[PDB]
Amino acid sequence: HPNAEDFGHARTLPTDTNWFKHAVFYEVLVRAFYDSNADGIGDLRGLTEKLDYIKWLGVDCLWLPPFYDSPLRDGGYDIRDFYKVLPEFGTVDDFVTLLDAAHRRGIRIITDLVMNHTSDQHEWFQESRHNPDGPYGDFYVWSDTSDRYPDARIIFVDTEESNWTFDPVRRQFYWHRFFSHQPDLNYDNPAVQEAMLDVLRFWLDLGIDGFRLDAVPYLFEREGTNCENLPETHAFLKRCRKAIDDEYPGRVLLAEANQWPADVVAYFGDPDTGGDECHMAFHFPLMPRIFMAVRRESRFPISEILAQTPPIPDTAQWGIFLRNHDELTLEMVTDEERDYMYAEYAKDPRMKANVGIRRRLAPLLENDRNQIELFTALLLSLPGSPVLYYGDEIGMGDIIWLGDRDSVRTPMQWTPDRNAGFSKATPGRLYLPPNQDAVYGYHSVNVEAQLDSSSSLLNWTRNMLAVRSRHDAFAVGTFRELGGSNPSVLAYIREVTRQQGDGGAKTDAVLCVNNLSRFPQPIELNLQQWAGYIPVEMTGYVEFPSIGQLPYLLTLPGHGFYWFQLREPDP
Amino acid sequence: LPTDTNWFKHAVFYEVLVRAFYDSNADGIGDLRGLTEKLDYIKWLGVDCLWLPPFYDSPLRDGGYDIRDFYKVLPEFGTVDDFVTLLDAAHRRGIRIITDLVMNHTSDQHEWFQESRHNPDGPYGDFYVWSDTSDRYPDARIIFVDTEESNWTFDPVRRQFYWHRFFSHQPDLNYDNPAVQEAMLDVLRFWLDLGIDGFRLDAVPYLFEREGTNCENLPETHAFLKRCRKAIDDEYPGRVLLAEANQWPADVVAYFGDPDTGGDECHMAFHFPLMPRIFMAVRRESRFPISEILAQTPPIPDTAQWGIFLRNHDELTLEMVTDEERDYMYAEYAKDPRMKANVGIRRRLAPLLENDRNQIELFTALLLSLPGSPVLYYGDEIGMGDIIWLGDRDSVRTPMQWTPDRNAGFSKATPGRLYLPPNQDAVYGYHSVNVEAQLDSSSSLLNWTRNMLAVRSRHDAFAVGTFRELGGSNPSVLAYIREVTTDAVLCVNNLSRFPQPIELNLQQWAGYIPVEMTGYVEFPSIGQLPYLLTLPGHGFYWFQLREPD
Ligand SMILES: [Ca+2]
Ligand SMILES: [Ca+2]
Ligand SMILES: [Cl-]
Ligand SMILES: [Cl-]
Ligand SMILES: [Cl-]
Ligand SMILES: [Cl-]
Ligand SMILES: [Cl-]
Ligand SMILES: [Cl-]
Ligand SMILES: [Cl-]
Ligand SMILES: [Mg+2]
Ligand SMILES: [Mg+2]
Known part of the structure; x- marks a missing residue:
């Protein structure tokens, strides 16, 4: 194996x-x-x-x-x-x-x-099958039979007849969960x-x-x-x-x-x-x-x-x-x-x-x-x-x-x-x-x-x-699914717990609304815990009406979505 | 028909x-x-x-x-x-x-093979080539040597090896x-x-x-x-x-x-x-x-x-x-x-x-x-x-x-x-x-x-027809005659990318008239002097050799 010393290294971030x-x-x-x-x-x-x-x-x-x-x-x-x-x-x-x-x-x-696993062309495997009592002899999983581990499924069931393959050189079977040319490491x-x-x-x-x-x-x-x-x-x-x-x-x-x-x-x-x-x-x-x-x-x-x-x-x-x-x-x-x-x-x-x-x-x-x-x-x-x-x-x-x-x-x-x-x-x-x-x-x-x-x-x-x-x-952020009147719309709010020396758009809560229907859909959301906050749509920065105690109506075109920053109101 | x-x-x-x-x-x-x-x-x-x-x-x-x-x-x-x-x-x-x-050979999905492996004592048991070892026929090369480790594959159902010259999913018939x-x-x-x-x-x-x-x-x-x-x-x-x-x-x-x-x-x-x-x-x-x-x-x-x-x-x-x-x-x-x-x-x-x-x-x-x-x-x-x-x-x-x-x-x-x-x-x-x-x-x-x-x-x-290679002056040109006995054709082919001349000894057909087969134009009759044909790069001609009146 090469040593990392003979190469350069990258400067660490x-x-x-x-x-x-x-x-x-x-x-x-x-x-x-x-x-x-x-x-x-x-x-x-x-x-x-x-x-x-x-x-x-x-x-x-x-x-x-x-x-x-x-x-x-x-x-x-x-x-x-x-x-x-x-x-x-x-x-x-x-x-x-x-x-x-x-x-x-x-x-x-x-x-x-x-x-x-490695390729069967890896030198460890060539040494393992040619020199069984050498240092790579037990680098792979070898057996005189194909009977071990019968409860393991064959992943590639339409391609591989068994998880054991007989090697012509070593004259024993080796284990592979993937293709026969990919022997498992032991x-x-x-x-x-x-x-x-x-x-x-x-x-x-x-x-x-x-x-x-x-x-x-x-x-x-x-x-x-x-x-x-x-x-x-x-x-x-x-x-x-x-x-x-x-x-x-x-x-x-x-x-x-x-x-x-x-x-x-x-x-x-x-x-x-x-x-x-x-x-x-x-x-x-x-x-x-x-x-x-x-x-x-x-x-x-x-x-x-x-x-x-x-x-x-x-x-x-x-x-x-x-x-x-x-x-x-x-x-x-x-x-x-x-x-x-x-x-x-x-x-x-x-x-x-x-x-x-x-x-x-x-x-x-x-x-x-x-x-x-x-x-x-x-x-x-x-x-x-x-x-x-x-x-x-x-x-x-x-x-x-x-x-x-x-x-x-x-x-x-x-x-x-x-x-x-x-x-x-x-x-x-x-x-x-x-x-x-x-x-x-x-x-x-x-x-x-x-x-x-x-x-x-x-x-x-x-x-x-x-x-x-x-x-x-x-x-x-946390994840809070908001439910809502309309089963065709997925709405959620995500929040930062907020510790020490923050306060700004970067840490404000966010509201996401997603229409899974191909047709325009209304959704009325109970956002009363955010009463007084101002939803600001994130791409164009337009201020939407402040959240009240009544259900908040959003309307979406087919497959549409909105992202809003929930801004704390002015005192 | x-x-x-x-x-x-x-x-x-x-x-x-x-x-x-x-x-x-x-x-x-x-x-x-x-x-x-x-x-x-x-x-x-x-x-x-x-x-x-x-x-x-x-x-x-x-x-x-x-x-x-x-x-x-x-x-x-x-x-x-x-x-x-x-x-x-x-x-x-x-x-x-x-x-x-x-x-x-057949696919391993063939019903014969599935019966051969599942029911060895049955009528399909010997329809394929089975062995307790992978040692037989060692002088046969592996055709797909980059893909198949052996011409013998161990079957997990029958628990014997079967022979295949092609891929493992193509067992050989016996x-x-x-x-x-x-x-x-x-x-x-x-x-x-x-x-x-x-x-x-x-x-x-x-x-x-x-x-x-x-x-x-x-x-x-x-x-x-x-x-x-x-x-x-x-x-x-x-x-x-x-x-x-x-x-x-x-x-x-x-x-x-x-x-x-x-x-x-x-x-x-x-x-x-x-x-x-x-x-x-x-x-x-x-x-x-x-x-x-x-x-x-x-x-x-x-x-x-x-x-x-x-x-x-x-x-x-x-x-x-x-x-x-x-x-x-x-x-x-x-x-x-x-x-x-x-x-x-x-x-x-x-x-x-x-x-x-x-x-x-x-x-x-x-x-x-x-x-x-x-x-x-x-x-x-x-x-x-x-x-x-x-x-x-x-x-x-x-x-x-x-x-x-x-x-x-x-x-x-x-x-x-x-x-x-x-x-x-x-x-x-x-x-x-x-x-x-x-x-x-x-x-x-x-x-x-x-x-x-x-x-x-x-x-x-x-x-x-028979096939007679005519040789000729120019190694860049391949010329031959096909003949059946009443129907004789001359084909000349330029293997060079450049124009090439070829002089052919066509004495045996002296008097005959070469008629080019696509346009039917009659070429000069064959005499006792070598017949010169000139071809463009990679060109060819087919001539019917027509008997004289
Ligand atoms: Ca493993
Ligand atoms: Ca055969
Ligand atoms: Cl790549
Ligand atoms: Cl995919
Ligand atoms: Cl993936
Ligand atoms: Cl076809
Ligand atoms: Cl049919
Ligand atoms: Cl080809
Ligand atoms: Cl072919
Ligand atoms: Mg390149
Ligand atoms: Mg069709």
Whole structure:
């Protein structure tokens, strides 16, 4: 393994143990964003050059999917070397340069790190199968039979015949929860635990701001269990958090656990220490419920998942995003016993058609601009830290035929020029082609075309992000659902607890009202506790009538929404 | 159709995918009824026989080469009744139909395999090749070496290993079981009874395995092929068997069978190295890669015929044929950046030639005048492009581009429901490349291609004539005569991008008048002095050698 010493490191931002609670994340693939060297493939230097756009957009942290050395048989989630970037993307030094440049603009970077397994091309595995009594002999999970752990499901049931695969060289079976070319690491071997902690430290020494830890529920296996969410798995996660907070204060760990929210709460750790595992975890059912709330023109699927979500440690934060599937497994989270909408998804033909396929926001919503704004408003005002996916801010489409994941991984559309301005290479050499249809194609949909008009989706999104950044209640406020006469309208207030040396718009309460119906709707709200306050609409700053003792009437167009600052009255 | 045991020697074939040609029912997928509705186009183009890749019921994990039921049409294409409708409509127009039939293996979803694994003591227990170990047949290479760790896979239900030369979801049939041989003969008869004109038999070199061998081309494999030919000969005279053997031509001749009988296995087999050699001949501006491959091809039985096509890869395995010992061009392909970029990917003719119309015409002229029965691939006649990102095979399987309308006129469905999207780029997109746009001008690639087919059809020499390479002063020009005995044709082809002169010794035909076949202009009669022909870069001429009064 390389040592971090022989590379540069990035200059660390000032320590801020709460930064991730206030952050808007931007998931961007290195391969897709910008090709600076005309090989048809996006690269680290290209991403570095585009930091000006990212800063202008106003996001706080980049989230990079895996960019490590890999044969790319499973999208790069099959890792061949944890210490090396895929050569086509650049080198470790290019990553340090990117980190420094990002940090200069106050922008942080996290990346995906797959903890559960490596590619079978990883040298640990080649040594494990060729030299069984060597130091890597027990780095993986080996057996003379395929009978162990029978209660564990096969995740990729239509592709893999078993969770055990017979290796022709070692003549024993090895365990894999994912594809056969992704052998599971043996976490019962303390050398494996130390090796993986050393991986985290390598990137942290370089200066990375954190990781999304992938496939963590599957680390340990035990007979008599379904081999997910085991005590020893959480124990290892506590080691990661301990190392993180002791040696690198102010960094973050995000858990990718595609489970019902009550079940992922455990991944934040012990409530009594304030949380001692992951700082963040994703709330996967939110988008499916929002999607269904709109289809149904009813607030309840949204009201319900929020009400039923258990409280989490003070230190912790949910991550939220506008996708219906986990990118690792392409599964939508559900629960037969605890999801009242369990059987309802299969009854919606749009939902049904896209089962197991990642889709971008605009295509999910049939390019309806009003709905894109509504879903985006919800993403930016509901509790949690939001993740925007690259290209959704201009309304990019997808290309489903490229694959279940690759559908959403086509080049960023910068201009209406050749290759959408992503590359100077010949089109036949692009890693994937840009969208070329009349609706989503780069001749029509690109950054340059949207920069001019204040009314473009890009400019609208950038303004919404700016507004959000100026109001703390969106990031760390309480959540109070207001109910109301009309079931088609979701209304809530978010409040800051307010301690010492504050008082201003930044800490004033906020009121959000969202119409899930396609038709204009009235709603009368009981806001009597805020009698005398003045609702000020956030985008145009117009003062609405002061709140009284009577119900407050707001009227919304189809799929419309309003955000108001609740200003304290003048004495 | 009235029996005509030589029809395949005179045929031009047209490989057309049911899924890609025409969607008549607006589900976004091409279908048999749709293909039937486009037969007038196929007749007008002038081809003689359709070649349909597998259209059987299948989970489509390996492009439909993974068959779930040999007796059933994939439901989205229609049913056996739609297939008979297609057959009758084609025959009415004098067009025949052959199809791919995978003989070596089935999908693991096939009911035979599910019975084999669940009920080992039952009648299907020995329908596949099972073993307690993965040690047998170690000399057989793994075809898909980057994907399959072994030719043996452990089945979790039966708890034994089964053999597969292809992907793990394609278990090999056990041809040492006599019931397997009878079941597969019965598949042949089922489609022949419906009226199909023949089959391309796929993966046949791999039927039998034997210890101490590489498990290809075994004598028992050829013995089973003889059973297939005999069944055809005895029960369905006038039908054809084509072999898909991606091997050096010398090795392929075995698939025509015993020369002493006039051939007792396949009627046809493919000459795979032809396109790679033509491609390199043009890259090097030398006739030699073509001259040599033809000269080194052994004689085949007189009732047999080579099939030829303008592709560098076999569609089953995505491999280009070669031979370390017998191919002088063996190390040369890797030195060509065009060949190197496209390794393991099917590409259409226009993209292979960077859309150079002169070269498209040159390669097509060679395809239509060299010895063998040519196969045209659907869409090449209008210059369609491909979409490589769709997959190594799906690259060339996008919808036929009929018009510049929505979905290229292939379907009325919404674009997001199409099985694959049409080309949409500035060069190959359906807004500029489509049948409708080319129908009008006599100078379109489509009308040029149609005219060349019409010309070829009027000269038996192209189909069954002898082949005499004329040599000549200039190594950049390939000249030859095709002759049958009363019909003699002279073909001259410029492999150089620049204009070239060639002086030919045509003394044997002195007095004859060369008549150029497209404009019918009479050229100077052949004398005792060498005949000078001058060609533009990548040009060609076809001449009928007419007897003097
Ligand atoms: Ca594990
Ligand atoms: Ca076999
Ligand atoms: Cl990437
Ligand atoms: Cl995800
Ligand atoms: Cl999704
Ligand atoms: Cl098909
Ligand atoms: Cl059927
Ligand atoms: Cl082929
Ligand atoms: Cl090809
Ligand atoms: Mg690049
Ligand atoms: Mg159809």
